[PDB]
Design a binder for this molecule. Sequence first.
Ligand SMILES: [Cl-]
Ligand SMILES: [Cl-]
Ligand SMILES: [Cl-]
Ligand SMILES: [Cl-]
Ligand SMILES: [Mg+2]
Ligand SMILES: [Mg+2]
Ligand SMILES: [Mg+2]
Ligand SMILES: [Mg+2]
Ligand SMILES: [Mg+2]
Lengths: 478, 479, 478, 477
Amino acid sequence: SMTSDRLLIKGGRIVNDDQSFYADIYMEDGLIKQIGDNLIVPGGVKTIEANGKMVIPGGIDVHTHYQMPYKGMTTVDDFFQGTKAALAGGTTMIIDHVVPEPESSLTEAYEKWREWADGKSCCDYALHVDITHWNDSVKQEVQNLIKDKGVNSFMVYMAYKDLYQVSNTELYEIFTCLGELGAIAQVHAENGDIIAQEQTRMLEMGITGPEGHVLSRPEELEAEAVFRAITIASQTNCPLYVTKVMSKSAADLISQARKKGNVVFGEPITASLGIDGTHYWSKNWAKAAAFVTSPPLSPDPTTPDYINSLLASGDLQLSGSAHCTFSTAQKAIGKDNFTAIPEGTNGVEERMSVIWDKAVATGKMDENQFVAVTSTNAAKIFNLYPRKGRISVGSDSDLVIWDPDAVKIVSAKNHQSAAEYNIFEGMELRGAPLVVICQGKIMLEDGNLHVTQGAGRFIPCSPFSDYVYKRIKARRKM
Amino acid sequence: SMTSDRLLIKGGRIVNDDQSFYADIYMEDGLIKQIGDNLIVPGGVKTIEANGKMVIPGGIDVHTHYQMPYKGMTTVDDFFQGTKAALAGGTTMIIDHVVPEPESSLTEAYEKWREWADGKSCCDYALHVDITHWNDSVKQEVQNLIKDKGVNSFMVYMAYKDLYQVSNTELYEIFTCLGELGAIAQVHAENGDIIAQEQTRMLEMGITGPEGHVLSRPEELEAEAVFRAITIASQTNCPLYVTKVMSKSAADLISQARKKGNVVFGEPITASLGIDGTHYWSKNWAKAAAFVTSPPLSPDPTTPDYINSLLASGDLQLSGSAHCTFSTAQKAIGKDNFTAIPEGTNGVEERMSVIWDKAVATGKMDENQFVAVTSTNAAKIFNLYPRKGRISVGSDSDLVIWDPDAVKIVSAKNHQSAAEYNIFEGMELRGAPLVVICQGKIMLEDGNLHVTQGAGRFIPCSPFSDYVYKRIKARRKMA
Amino acid sequence: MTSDRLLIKGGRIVNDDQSFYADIYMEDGLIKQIGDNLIVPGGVKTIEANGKMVIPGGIDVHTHYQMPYKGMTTVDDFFQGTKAALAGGTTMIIDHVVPEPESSLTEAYEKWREWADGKSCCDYALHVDITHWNDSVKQEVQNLIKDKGVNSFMVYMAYKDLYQVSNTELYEIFTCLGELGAIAQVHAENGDIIAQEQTRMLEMGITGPEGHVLSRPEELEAEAVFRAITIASQTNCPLYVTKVMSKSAADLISQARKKGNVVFGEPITASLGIDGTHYWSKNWAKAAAFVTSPPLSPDPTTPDYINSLLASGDLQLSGSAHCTFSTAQKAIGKDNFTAIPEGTNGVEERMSVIWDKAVATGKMDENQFVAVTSTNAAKIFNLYPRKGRISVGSDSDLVIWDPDAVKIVSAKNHQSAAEYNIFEGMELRGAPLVVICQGKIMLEDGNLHVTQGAGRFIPCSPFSDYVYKRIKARRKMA
Amino acid sequence: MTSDRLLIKGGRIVNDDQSFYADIYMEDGLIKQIGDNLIVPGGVKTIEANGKMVIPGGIDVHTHYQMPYKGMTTVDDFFQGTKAALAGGTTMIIDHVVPEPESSLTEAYEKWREWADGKSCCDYALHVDITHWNDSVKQEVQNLIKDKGVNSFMVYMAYKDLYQVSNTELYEIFTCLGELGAIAQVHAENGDIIAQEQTRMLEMGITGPEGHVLSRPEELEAEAVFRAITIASQTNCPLYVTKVMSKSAADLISQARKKGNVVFGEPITASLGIDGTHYWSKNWAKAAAFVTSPPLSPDPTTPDYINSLLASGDLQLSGSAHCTFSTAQKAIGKDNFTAIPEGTNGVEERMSVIWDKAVATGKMDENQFVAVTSTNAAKIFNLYPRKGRISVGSDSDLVIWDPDAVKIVSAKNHQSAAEYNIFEGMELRGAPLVVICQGKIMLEDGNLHVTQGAGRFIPCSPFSDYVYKRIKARRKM
Ligand SMILES: [Cl-]
Ligand SMILES: [Cl-]
Ligand SMILES: [Cl-]
Ligand SMILES: [Cl-]
Ligand SMILES: [Mg+2]
Ligand SMILES: [Mg+2]
Ligand SMILES: [Mg+2]
Ligand SMILES: [Mg+2]
Ligand SMILES: [Mg+2]
């Protein structure tokens, strides 16, 4: 790593995913150098007294959309403001989605994302590459991005008919390929064919408000796509990763598949963990539009509690935010037609507090599983353990002094995001970060961010991570 | 109905789906005329003494393929020999599938099926019409078949890519249309896109035998299609009917949907009720080929017991056979490539004994639920109750004197089918018919069939049967 | 016995198997002809149904009229309670004989017969509660079945040190009832754990009615149900779960039936109509009026789900457990929820509640409605087709039902002596217009026409086919 | 002359969280360094691992060495039985203290300590069975937790009129154990209904071993499991289901865990390795050798399924319940299955069975194998990371494991004194090559090198985080 001053944290309760213990932590030049008691260190090292508070690995948000092109527009939180929002909330790494235009080069899109992120990201980051269309030369590009460019994760779309949607035949070809090359097959799993029809029906009945968005994507259509993707991934002996798990029925399909032995992961996001979809019916149009995202927040109010429960039980493994913010003015292009409302909400800053408040303080999971679902499982899946997601000697110095007793109200007044709205507005959350260390530097202290634009490094992610692929390889050899 | 002599059955245990009781039955001119004791009857009426044996409504096999065209060939049991096989096994009505070629007229195919069946069927029958392609004029034909030709059931294919398979958009349009017109939407539910790929893979590894057939259609691909069809049918408020339920996973999806309130039916067949798919690996090639059907018999040997269990519990509702037989010589065209083995097995003659043996004698269901899953549920679904599927005054005189203590070994030597092979060969089955009455005539007595070719009548089936559609209509009336 | 001739014309006859238009001619308690242009004597009283539905009269399989309780008696006796039944479209009731422990079952039965024969407005039958067990009770159970028209007996898993029976006793009882051809009913909650949870709730100063529901969480219904299912399966005895209140309990029955177990579930008007949120009402007397065991679930998703399973056949029939107490009797428990007497209303509202919640919402059709209000009860209890069916030879108990009528339920207007109605203010679609019982018009134009004691006891034979054919075939097997 | 230093080179270290290549240096019972080109003293004994796996030693959480039974004793004592453990790659065992009803728990514990301290070849710990319940037992439970290194106590739902406790007692016991930070274990079968079914089976003339399985159908395991789960949930007490034998029982645990309940399941070698069809063997002695409670399921789909749920984490850890009896002791029950003493072998075969049934079949990887053979047991029983992990500072118990070895299991070749092996003739992929325990080489080249009594008792503190942090948070709402 890059240089950073020496730094010693004393009296912390170190909390990894496997255990908790009291020890001091000595850091230098981006790395954790020693862990233990009465450490022999040079004189005059900057020393932080943790005072029994928790020290956890920094959060890894595996799903972001910073400065994402969308129909001429760009999301309002770019790689600089968006990672300030990440760090403010205890997240020290992000993994964004490269989105090439159909009939455009995957690799050129990747180079373009790299230039944006290398110049702006405050913290370390990596990339998924979205497979928005499929043909032989895309397949060649996929191969090269894995071999040469530090990519191990690719997402296909089952939604967005005539834009990104791929057929069952293409899903089989793609999964077959990604499995052979040791990559993670990600999906955006909703049935675009049926959604397309339901949109038309909803518009025809005169339902043009944001409620038309959630009503034309009932969870049954997420569940169907998830099952179909699970089925095809199983036949092609390819590991599957369901992005943005929003409904109970979808999560149950992942739970059921994992019990059978299928290699399948589920990624709930801050939105589905934090809140429900009743606000699509808000008399305040701009508020309702701010919740518009796909798949949508479920209107079933039992949903968020249930998603936290399955994240706690390991039926879901890791969290993201799918942070994809648009301005009030950009949202308003869809005022008389919900299909023109740009899709996306906030959630990068709030992810870790939401999970602590909903799943730890309610007793569903303990602090160690909290570390697993905020960083360590992401690190293992994406072949970043234990460099990330673990406080141990040799690992990167990304870590957070966490206060389980802190209590904050979430507001757009106070968030790092450029967005005028926050879908978690007015929610009181237990659990918050006090101090954030990233690359061995103090980037959050006493409410203040200390960041340098572009300091973030791209972290290449190798294929065939053991946690995912050893089972796959044993199944092949049979 | 047409003329038949008067006929009296005395001392029977009448077994309907709702109750059992002792009464005599008087029949005349195709109809049941009286039911009760010490019936006042004319002199010289032919009288059959039932001697405490069961009298049940005749079986309705809701899935047959008599003399079906298949790639230049024809199945070997035509409408005449095939309904002799039906009657020999206690089935008095069949419902066959009209299969029009893609891009061809549904109505012309229907007329062709009517001519074949009207001239040959020994017993009453009706028709499903397969929607093998979709466009505006097919939709117009569907409309007319329902209005003018006594059709209320249509099947779509999720399998057979580039032959019959329809897209999700087409599934939605079809289910929307069939639901509006009051028809039953049937599905052949397997994922044809993935099967196509898996066939290619299996051939490339050199697996050309019949095991390649089952290995390229694993139950996962039935289940997926079933779930997708269930999902679309729910969104379009259309009742769904899953034909040939073969696996545990598929039947669980139907079970799960019904519990949520979805109007969904499942049709296991004699094959999935009677036996498993281990025989695809038989060293006798011709035997293995004889089991080749789609979806295939599951290799999981726990499957038949479980399918009977869910038919007993009402998670599955009715039985068919999908009787679709080919000769040894016809099967053999697929000797070097499992994909060219013609698809289909026997099962019309054995359906009722198989269910009795596997579900009634093992205690899973009682005799009354046996009547429901062999006739009465079929009658209610297809809008034929109580003319069929019930012994009561005014109903048709199709009925069977059934012996719950009889025990028969199934063999190709003894079956009515023209096929050289029987997939239930050597199986001992408890429960068998003794006497069969159809149109008020004795068509099976003391082991002998008494049939007239072409005596069968086409039974028109009206749309909007209450059992299926009252719930649908009530749902149409809400937000 | 005698009733005037009576003809109903222009009705839509609705049985559980089909619906059709025909006229109905009745005489001397029996249906005599069904069809069109019926040849009948001159001057027969004629009712024009005008296309409205004619259904078999309701069979409420669970009542507690004038039930002894701690010196007191429920306020609806066999006369007032069956007026309430008939007002709501129910023409038959089946009440529970409750002998004191250590007391004769048969003497209690004779006492119940005298009360009911002298007061019941309509036909009725009896369950006998097995409140203790020993060899002479077993002899009595045998006599009641052979000689006294009883085929249904209930054991208690709740009420420790009062009625609760041990696992050993359950096995003996289920073995015996199964050999003699009877229905084994259960009040299935774990009384041992409830006893402890009561103590705990009192010790946290929770004396209000919320303590009642909070000390009987559904987990304790579910446990008992599973244990009763298990023992009944080992002893090859059919099981009948009374008062199914929770989702978890109904799922255990659903699951058992799918495995082929002979098991029935009896939801009641309360669990079908409403939830348990009202145990937290600041109006103490209102909250106390919901106190019954097992309790109404506080999970508001419960009533919709119970209707769903009744629609799907996972539950088969409905009762009310009508067991009413006065405001003054309820108030005994004002400082201790354990002294609040247990029971609510529901006999009058059962059929409207099910129509409104399950038929008008599209979950079941009218024919399944007849099944769950009369025909399945008749088959289980060996009363088909004398009851639960409009056909020649059956008893003339029937109702002209208006699927379009709309009524608000109030204590002002109910037949019950109780000051409170748990369904107060609820608007219900579906209501009876005319009620015929024993061939006599007992409800017409909002007015009841009853004769005290006109009801007959209906003996119920053992071994009903619907229940026992499967059991017998299993007995015969190796 | 005074020390055991030991270096293992060229191993593939396999922990439950990750795998990597490094050398391992050990001294005086501890792992001292892990890495490459380690600076080490001259003349240190060096073992070349040659790319083979190095895993933490197995922890068998369920044994019954030299257990009393009706005046008799199981034939594998603490010495021979831990030789069998080590031979199969297990370096720690946790046995059950069984006090007689109406007898002191603490006196039974002292007796178990004397037996085991004098004989065990390897480290060990103890569960204490609560075979009866009253105020002074409760006092003893408290003292064993505070002063005697016990954190795990088992109750019985079976054995009516011998050990069985009532629902009220279950509630009291779970309430107490939860407050004191202990693991509540259960032997979960309905003893009331089993007692009846035994009598019925004898009265039909079914006296052979088939009567044993037929009188304990899995329905009765499942019922007891659900009841125990239910009571433990109400009392906010963590529950541990010993000897998970059936699919239905394991589903109940799976279902509870998904709801958030703190519940663990312990399949054993028997339910992981084989089924119950052999209760019908015409060879009586063979059938009797399978007699254990709960019994092996006759449903042959069972062992595959148990492995599947152990792979998915629906079950967490493995034991053997090693409880062996001689042919002669088994034969007491020749005319009555109820007199057949209950127990089978399994300590030696546990790790190879799991590797063969779950790793070689692709259900789980090698790292989850480590979790279900040692690391999850260590975390549950408050022994992580001293046990169940190859890391600096942890105990030097570890195994060089050969994923490619293939062995046939036979009684000819096992360490056990028993004449019968329920896994007789089974071919198993996966075997240990070398076993290190307390830093000493106790297995090399097919030979055991053990010293009787070298084992140490390992005190197990209450409130292990993995189990109790969720419980405490719930207490606090
Ligand atoms: Cl879309
Ligand atoms: Cl196909
Ligand atoms: Cl109680
Ligand atoms: Cl026992
Ligand atoms: Mg940079
Ligand atoms: Mg004809
Ligand atoms: Mg009277
Ligand atoms: Mg009640
Ligand atoms: Mg020692």
